[PDB]
Design an enzyme around this catalytic site. Structure first.
Site, PDB file in Angstrom:
ATOM      1  N   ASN A  10       0.856  -1.183   0.000  1.00 56.38           N
ATOM      2  CA  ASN A  10       0.000   0.000   0.000  1.00 56.38           C
ATOM      3  C   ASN A  10       0.894   1.235   0.000  1.00 56.38           C
ATOM      4  OD1 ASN A  10      -1.869   2.037   0.372  1.00 56.38           O
ATOM      5  ND2 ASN A  10      -2.502   1.363   2.433  1.00 56.38           N
ATOM      6  N   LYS A  12       0.011   4.258  -0.158  1.00 57.16           N
ATOM      7  CA  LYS A  12      -0.696   5.353   0.512  1.00 57.16           C
ATOM      8  C   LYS A  12      -0.584   6.611  -0.354  1.00 57.16           C
ATOM      9  CE  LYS A  12      -0.048   3.092   4.962  1.00 57.16           C
ATOM     10  NZ  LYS A  12      -0.092   3.305   6.453  1.00 57.16           N
ATOM     11  N   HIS A  96      -9.440   0.466   4.633  1.00 52.76           N
ATOM     12  CA  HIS A  96      -8.175   0.713   5.306  1.00 52.76           C
ATOM     13  C   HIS A  96      -8.400   1.540   6.565  1.00 52.76           C
ATOM     14  CE1 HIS A  96      -4.072   2.174   6.090  1.00 52.76           C
ATOM     15  NE2 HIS A  96      -3.709   1.068   5.464  1.00 52.76           N
ATOM     16  N   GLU A  98      -6.934   3.973   7.885  1.00 50.38           N
ATOM     17  CA  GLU A  98      -6.875   5.423   7.736  1.00 50.38           C
ATOM     18  C   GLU A  98      -8.185   5.988   7.193  1.00 50.38           C
ATOM     19  OE1 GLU A  98      -3.351   5.438   5.354  1.00 50.38           O
ATOM     20  OE2 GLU A  98      -2.146   4.880   7.112  1.00 50.38           O
ATOM     21  N   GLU A 166      -5.347  -5.080  10.578  1.00 48.91           N
ATOM     22  CA  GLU A 166      -4.456  -3.978  10.925  1.00 48.91           C
ATOM     23  C   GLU A 166      -4.474  -3.769  12.431  1.00 48.91           C
ATOM     24  OE1 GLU A 166      -4.485  -0.433   8.213  1.00 48.91           O
ATOM     25  OE2 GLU A 166      -6.476  -1.207   7.738  1.00 48.91           O
ATOM     26  N   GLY A 172       1.937   3.782  15.349  1.00 53.95           N
ATOM     27  CA  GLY A 172       2.088   5.146  15.807  1.00 53.95           C
ATOM     28  C   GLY A 172       1.766   5.393  17.263  1.00 53.95           C
ATOM     29  N   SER A 212       3.381  -3.690  11.513  1.00 47.57           N
ATOM     30  CA  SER A 212       4.763  -3.435  11.134  1.00 47.57           C
ATOM     31  C   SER A 212       5.486  -4.736  10.796  1.00 47.57           C
ATOM     32  CB  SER A 212       5.482  -2.699  12.264  1.00 47.57           C
ATOM     33  OG  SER A 212       6.819  -2.409  11.900  1.00 47.57           O
TER      34      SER A 212
END
Ligand code: NA
Ligand code: NA
Lengths: 250, 250
Positions: A10, A12, A96, A98, A166, A172, A212
């Site tokens: 991805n 992004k 996704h 996000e 995910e 983060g 990750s």
């Protein structure tokens, strides 16, 4: 038959014409396990989909990062699934993390997108995942099952679906998810599929890890019983993406 | 000096490679008023921006239908302003009624997009407009002023901004908004700019009409004192778009 390892990249909201040419050339020169061993999908921004499709090796496949929930028309700024089919783009990433968080896509909105994309002939990487707040509240499987159920209720065929888990709570936040934590969610999700859809769907549906992934944990992550590959974020712009594809060799 | 007439064509979520070729060829063969008389912008979906830019006559200009609010990065499915600049796309439509309503873009979100797009060197068609419910409540100018103020609060240079007023309420009421109805909103909007920004910005900023435009009203609308052109919707896909451009000849 065992589930074929799947690696999606991805990109992004990243890329320039010069950078895309470099990424594509590096992928085209890569020597990776056979198509029988690993399925590779790369996902550029909309404006680069024709360029990447026209120049990428034919044994890697192209995905859009999103598409609209229904037929085209008066939806300024959106890209319909039939547009992607017209441009010979075979895959789409939907739901996704996000888009669920920043753009407030609901699970039903995502589920409607998956069903419509499948009805147009696209293959779908359907994303699920719980936030940090949801995990600390002990709602991990409640959230992931609800996100998956919204999709399951709306589709008629799982053959062309890959689920990406995910662990948003780790991205983060400073936290780091362990291969055991990933296997725990994947196992439970596949168990949900066996109970609520069918045993065959649970056995055959790839569930890929969207947290990750690097050279250090790729072997241990990919070797988990219920982890069938990766949805790679930023590393998909980089040469190390090829290293991640190579985790398919066991 | 007088404001140059401006005709924008918003393709919305429409187009195939074949249909795009036909549209562009018809535009390329059109014979319309000089570039001193009319400024023409066409706005395809993201996936056709390189194709249209590479084939369209150089005196018509290309716009994206949307872009992201800030620098690119971890924003799956979004297209950044710097991507548009990288692809030599000079314009972007921001705040379209369909994105405010269906995708819930707030006035502040739209304002931040306008400022970021201008900062990257893009030219902006900034869209405002009230719903049927808002108009029937007597809030037309409350709403249009609030949407415009959110942009004005974030923008220091208006030179590369065109404002499009969309009478969203006219879709619900099934009404062809009259030329007098367009003029009254455009006039009040321009008066708002004069009082809240500057007299110079009010005098020089094009305010284009984003309602239904046809042969029965194109001359009557374009001739209004505070209407400086059109943001065309679905007709922009059709040869009749050329007749709307020709309304600039007075
Ligand atoms: Na595995
Ligand atoms: Na006028």
């Amino acid at each position: 038959m065992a589930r074929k390892f799947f690696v999606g990249g991805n990109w992004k909201c990243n890329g320039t014409a010069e950078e895309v040419k470099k990424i594509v050339n590096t992928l085209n020169e890569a020597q990776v396990p056979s198509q029988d061993v690993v399925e590779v999908v790369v996902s550029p921004p909309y404006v680069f989909l024709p360029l990447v499709k026209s120049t990428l090796r034919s044994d890697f496949f192209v995905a859009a990062q999103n598409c609209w929930v229904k037929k085209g028309g008066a939806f300024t700024g959106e890209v319909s699934a039939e547009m992607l089919v017209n441009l010979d783009i075979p895959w789409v990433i939907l739901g996704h993390s996000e888009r669920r968080a920043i753009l407030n896509e609901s699970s039903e909105f995502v589920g409607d997108k998956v069903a419509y994309a499948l009805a147009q002939g696209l293959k779908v990487i359907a994303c699920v995942g719980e936030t940090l707040e949801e995990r600390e509240a002990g709602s991990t499987m409640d959230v992931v099952a609800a996100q998956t159920k919204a999709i399951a209720d709306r589709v008629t065929n799982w053959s062309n679906v890959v689920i990406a888990y995910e662990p948003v709570w780790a991205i983060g936040t400073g936290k780091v998810a362990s291969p055991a934590q990933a296997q725990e969610v994947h196992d439970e999700l596949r168990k949900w599929l066996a109970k609520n859809v069918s045993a065959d769907v649970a056995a055959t549906t790839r569930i890929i890890y969207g947290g990750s992934v690097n050279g250090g944990n790729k072997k241990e992550l990919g070797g988990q019983a219920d982890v069938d590959g990766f949805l790679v974020g930023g590393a998909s712009l980089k040469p190390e993406f090829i290293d991640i594809i190579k985790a398919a060799e066991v």
